[PDB]
Amino acid sequence: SAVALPRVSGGHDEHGHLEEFRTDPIGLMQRVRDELGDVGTFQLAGKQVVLLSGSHANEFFFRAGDDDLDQAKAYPFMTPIFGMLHNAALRGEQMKGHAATIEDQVRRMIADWGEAGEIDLLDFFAELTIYTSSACLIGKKFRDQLDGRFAKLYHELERGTDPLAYVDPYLPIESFRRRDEARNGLVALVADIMNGRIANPSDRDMLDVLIAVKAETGTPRFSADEITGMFISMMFAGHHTSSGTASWTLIELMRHRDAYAAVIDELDELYGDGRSVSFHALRQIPQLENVLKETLRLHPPLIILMRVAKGEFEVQGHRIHEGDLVAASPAISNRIPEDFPDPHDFVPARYEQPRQEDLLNRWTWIPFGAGRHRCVGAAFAIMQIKAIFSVLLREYEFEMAQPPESYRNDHSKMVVQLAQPAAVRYRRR
Template identity: 45%
Template sequence: MTAQQTSTSKEPEKMPGALPLIGNMLKFGKNPYEYMSLLRSKLGEIGEFRLFHQQMILLTGPEGNEAFFRAPDDQLDQNEAYKVMTPIFGKGVVFDAPPHIKDQQLKMLMPVLRDKPMRTYSKIIVQEVEEAVKDWGESGEVDLLEFMKQLTIYTSSHCLLGNEFRYELNEEFSRLYHDLEKGMHPIAFIFPYLPIPILRRRDKARIRLQELVTEIIEKRAQKTEKSDDAFQMLIDTRYEDGSPLSPHEITGLLIGTLFAGHHTTAGTAAWITLELARNPKEMDRVLEEFDTLYGHDGEVTFQSLREIPFFERVIKEVLRIHPPLIMLIRKVAKDLHFKDYVIKAGKYVCVSPRVSHRIPEIFPDPEKFDPDRFTKERQEDATPFSWVAFGGGRHKCSGNAFAMLQLKAIYAILLRRYKFELVDPPESYQDDYTEMVVQPGSPCMVRYSKRDNIQQTEVESKKAAEETVSKQNCFKVDVDYDLCQGHANCMAEAAEIFQVDDKGMLTVLQETPDNTLLKKAQAAAQYCPTGAIKIKQD
């Protein structure tokens, strides 16, 4: 919670040990998580450190996270903080665009991540997984991280970008995307145009990708039938003044679309296998859930992927322990007041999901892998902004729903086909902090063996006695519009209550609906990717 300015406002304490010119960069660069954890232990939920010339304020814990994520854009500026993305997305695209243009561009990306197209993606992902493992045989070893990187680039490009990227350009596109992703090196956050090999490869990849995009635009213009993918959507879309996107802008937004769907998923996918292999009892529970629902050959559908609550908790616990982003950053455009402190304009403020996720007062025994933290009985994440793996507020990751769908669909096939065990000692699998997107260290070897004789468990369906449904208004729909991103999942679940227009604007048609709509309203709240909907019962 952000406090009002008072006469007693003070500046945050500074971490000792800053060196001339480089500040605290040496210790931070060695292991950012350990350094930020040390800062919290020494200074509390707010403290300052310096990376070269940049003064950084770290906020941790639910209240610090909320102050960060709920601050308006004219106070905490994303654009200035993420200049590292300008060479990747392109000049004038997203973080380098003026606010009114950036807002329009981000809205252009939303339709492909909304509920209706999402319902078609599970079949595509299943197809890609089956293709990826068709030559695995009865048993063997695989570098899990490299496998997941390749698989998720195929699933994401197939679902989000279109057939040209998946089938015609798959090898070259994968290489170009890899070079772009490597361009998110920690040093690039400080010096985005430093003339070093990894950043030169980034720039060459961006130029070549725009050439490929321009060629595809020209080919598509010759066709009579239009595709229904994100690429075609960006070709056809228009700014509010009626002007089309340029090939330069389309290239940047396609990269943005893929980052939303793939950028952090490969590492999370790998950690799911690693943590389940480290915790055999939890692996058995996942297998039982999948086998009960699907058997050996049961169809994986959008709806069935909603019916695996334990595996959803597994994903959430993996993201608690291994959030992909080291930290999220904003530049302070106007003084930010937090409790008794003032963070001066011109400084940078950041939050670290990994540090916040290991606060024992919120998540007891935080190093333990325990998916049941998130059961209704325990709800250790009940405090708002305590679990922030996908960020929070109006800028919560727009690709989080696709990422969850992708992970569930991948494992609905993988874990029914194969058993997995670790090749190396469990403690040897550690996070790699040399890049801004944290993944398991490479190589990441696991051993697989084929599963046979999977039996679908008979589940007794107990019919509850029919209850007389009252039509009395006994619940209220509460929407935090600051969190809503226009995914339209709510409208798909309860069109009688929610309406989302083509621009992603939500209207609540009934704030106190009849009790007959309670289950639909609860489903809308449950499947809202940003948690913007709450159902309050009398």
């Protein structure tokens, strides 16, 4: 019985649909839903990906236990990179402080901005998010010993996630080589901070905690190599997502001056009570929030969510087998026509009380995913954007220095990022 799941057209290239997935993954995924519907597959090298879409299919996907759809082995490119977080830095009691930390990191970042100038959205926000994450999730003391170097290396790590990892995480290609060398540079970086603390024993941070943990032998339990990895781990899920979202929030505001105007008036109005960013970032900021939600629907940082099937299951009559990669796609589900009218349109109103399309499509509006394993950093990420823009939009006004269309994502790697250049002009309000 040579029966198989329905497969999307194409896949002609050497590694099937891989070549396409590295160029236009969203187009490939839309063609799957368009030709096959809710359940369809495409081939990534040797592996088959079972792409689920639509409310019913996604519900099955998100309500499944880690015993059915495991995430652990779904992203082999993470092994070389790495080599819970919630308890350490995401406790609600900590949000207020993180709001202040973030505000401080932003003001520090733009400190040399002056009157007017230009920045690159990817460069600015990517580095800014390294500082906010490192400062909040690990500690300011640690962040203060970091600079553009750490950021540049961390970026090489993210550019080391070419879909070819599904063939082998250690292929002798350039991106995988750069990835390994970059991590080697991150260890040298962390080791230097570690030796400074040991040679010269106060506010304590997560690095202090990891350095102090002793093995039963009495010897320290973690090496510089292991600490760097854990640190890379703590910041990975929150870095490229925040950087990208921040970039696309400013891009959309700039593309739609009407939304920009509204956000600005509301911020000046909100802050008119004299309270701080750490006070307002934890509280409602409607216009800004709806622009954010609309930015996440149109440009979700994770365009595909992966899993490895453990058992034998059936989704809408189609049979999934153990070993199959099962996948959900926020890029695709977030634009399903019947759930989000004019899906390709930037319509913040979509989330105002009268519609709240985000809450009426619990299994389709999945920029943060859904179910039990819905992004645990969601509240932090929202607070961060509020905190970041409360500072930027009040101090500076922005404008595009390139055609509106040239602002787009780079889909060559599993981790999505803004293509360059992404130049933007700024000027003090």
